Design a protein around this nucleic acid. Structure first.
Ligand SMILES: *C[C@@H]1C(=O)C2CCN1CC2
Ligand SMILES: *C[C@@H]1C(=O)C2CCN1CC2
Ligand SMILES: *C[C@@H]1C(=O)C2CCN1CC2
Ligand SMILES: *C[C@@H]1C(=O)C2CCN1CC2
Ligand SMILES: *C[C@H]1C(=O)C2CCN1CC2
Ligand SMILES: *C[C@H]1C(=O)C2CCN1CC2
Ligand SMILES: *C[C@H]1C(=O)C2CCN1CC2
Ligand SMILES: *C[C@H]1C(=O)C2CCN1CC2
Ligand SMILES: [Zn+2]
Ligand SMILES: [Zn+2]
Ligand SMILES: [Zn+2]
Ligand SMILES: [Zn+2]
Lengths: 195, 195, 195, 195
DNA sequence: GGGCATGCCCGGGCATGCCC
DNA sequence: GGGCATGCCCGGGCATGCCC
């Protein structure tokens, strides 16, 4: 009956976790200490999917954004009106999160919660590789007036079988911004000094 | 053939000029040194109309915004998409400038230049008074993404007869902002120090 | 019989001349010493038209680009293939020079010389003003491979009556570039040191 | 479901690897330290194919370019518009990579990913020889505006049987430029000093 | 082979909505 | 009223086609 999706980490029976690749305006930078990706608008944000056991055929990978703070959790995360009026052919203009480089992407609007998500098939790593990578794009800055409006979000990645069973769930915070390197360095310093 | 309206001051045969009434977040404050009004979003911005000779019956007062900088002059000033989706009953949501407190306001979209304008009847001062005041409202901040986007505007006020003849023109710069007193003080200080 | 238009200054009986408004990446900067405008791609380049005597009704203003160097004069100046595949509604994509802010702009391809030009009506200055301003845009950098390719151009402005008589002609060099302030300062220094 | 081809080295059951032949503007020079070929536009770039075991009859050799950087991987590498408008009879003008000196070259456009590829038959070395050489040509510089636009590419070379099975994969970075010797020396020095 | 011109890149710093 | 976060701006400097 809740309209807020769970954010609880659940590595599950397949041992599912995420991984991230390792400069003031670098396109993206991940902070392990904050479990937080700092990236730029509409630029590639690679996310690695790691499993210990191979999921069954037909497994899907869903990404959804939610507001991190209790006061805003129940608000659906959407693109701002400006960037909505700004396409790749498939992503509805209201969706914040896109996937690039995938021929089987699906964009969903939940008919009960109104929340947006984007789904791609799970592909196992190629022989000799330990993970599979998805290229996400965030189509607004965290600061956009009328959209995220300086409020932090979480991206929730779920691994789901074809029947809809939850196989695994993970999440990370996102700050989309002009200067990821600056903003990560400042947040990490405030954490150490004042957190 | 130009689509940019004139901004040239023209006091005209009636001696037409503007006047302004005389704190970090005051609702509005006018800088004579900069010929610039600093005011808050959707709050009253009074402008006085002064004439030496009484205009003829059916005279009208039009207000229109243009970008001040040469690089932006040819672009129509519009409300940003966020505030457009935010009414008083008569103002189209795309118009930046509204008039409050007037039963005869007319909002115009130019069919050739696409520029917006707001018009009210000219009313002579009451006996013993030297001027007539119009309460304007600016419906975005100068900073709004997808709108003014930090670009300065001028408001051009024209006195026109019923036939459309230009009787007088004056203009002033406008900065719509959260903190008019701070922003005025900073710009005036930079003018004296570095202008 | 020549396919190269004249560039000879001809102030004519109306006393026609141009004027220019007076920072590393400023949008544009004019060098009187070089008679040369340094501006940015697709940004406003204002040019003032000055006359001593009022031209007759129906006078037009034409702008055309030609290569300045003898070795390239006979080559038609065009947009590069990249920027051609990049509109305002009226300018053909092959034209280098556009006019913004004018409801009566006309773009011409000469059927014999294949050269491009853009024409607007001449409007006399408003009462109290000494000149009329046209906002040109250059849609390629001087450096564009396959277009100007680092070769300098001249813009030729002609004042023509409705019948086609040449009333006046002027010209200026143009360098469209990323950093007008840098490039002007460097060229002026080399002129003084080595010219 | 991905539209980005794998770049993972796979020597495979046949022991497949590449080899390269060993001056500021030399036509080409290969850096083992960088696994990077530096070569000139439209000039021969020989690549050797080495195998430990003889591939089956009907084996084919495919070459394809992808952008090396994560941010650009999902974009198809194409010739820039200028050089596209510049042929050998068989290569489509949009293809960056050509093969010279082969009577059986095939140029392919993938109907799903839109990526370009060039394929020739695999020929075993002549008796006494240890490798077979293919002469590739790169038809734009890495710097070309509207094409690679200064972004590094990889060339992915795949050995495939007639049925389409992947037998082996190798790749190398390519920098197409005016001065291969200069650019190699500079990148190798920056690697040692700052890498 | 030595060197220039020029698009584009930063790391330093401003303006401004919003917070106390 | 005092102060932070954040998009965007520079002036300094690199990479690279082309010139001698
Ligand atoms: C997760 C894996 C790795 O460890 C490297 C980088 C991304 N994938 C493919 C190779
Ligand atoms: C212009 C006049 C005045 O001088 C005061 C203030 C505004 N109006 C009415 C009275
Ligand atoms: C040429 C004239 C002037 O002298 C100023 C600036 C541009 N026009 C209008 C006013
Ligand atoms: C790979 C072989 C060699 O070692 C030499 C040079 C190129 N091929 C033919 C002979
Ligand atoms: C931080 C951000 C900026 O402001 C520019 C330089 C570095 N980064 C990218 C653009
Ligand atoms: C400048 C502005 C603010 O930030 C608050 C205090 C004063 N003013 C109004 C609200
Ligand atoms: C010279 C040019 C640049 O390289 C950036 C800063 C100044 N100018 C505009 C952008
Ligand atoms: C680097 C390049 C040049 O600029 C010329 C000399 C050497 N090389 C070929 C042409
Ligand atoms: Zn946005
Ligand atoms: Zn707004
Ligand atoms: Zn161009
Ligand atoms: Zn090219």
């Amino acid at each position: 009956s809740s309209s807020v999706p769970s954010q609880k980490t659940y590595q599950g029976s397949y041992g599912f976790r995420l991984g991230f690749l390792h400069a003031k305006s670098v396109t993206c930078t991940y902070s392990p200490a904050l479990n937080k990706m700092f990236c730029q608008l509409a630029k590639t944000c690679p996310v690695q999917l790691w499993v210990d056991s191979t999921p069954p055929p037909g497994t899907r990978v869903r990404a959804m954004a939610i507001y991190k703070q209790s006061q805003h959790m129940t608000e659906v995360v959407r693109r701002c009106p400006h960037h909505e009026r700004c396409s790749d052919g498939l992503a509805p203009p209201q969706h914040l999160i896109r996937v690039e480089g995938n021929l089987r992407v699906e964009y969903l609007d939940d008919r009960n919660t109104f929340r947006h998500s984007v789904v791609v098939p799970y592909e196992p790593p190629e022989v000799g590789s330990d993970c599979t990578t998805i290229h996400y794009n965030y189509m607004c800055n965290s600061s956009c007036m009328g959209g995220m409006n300086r409020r932090p979000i979480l991206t929730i990645i779920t691994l789901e079988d074809s029947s809809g069973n939850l196989l695994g769930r993970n999440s990370f915070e996102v700050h989309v911004c002009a200067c990821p390197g600056r903003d990560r360095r400042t947040e990490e310093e405030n954490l150490r000094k004042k957190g």
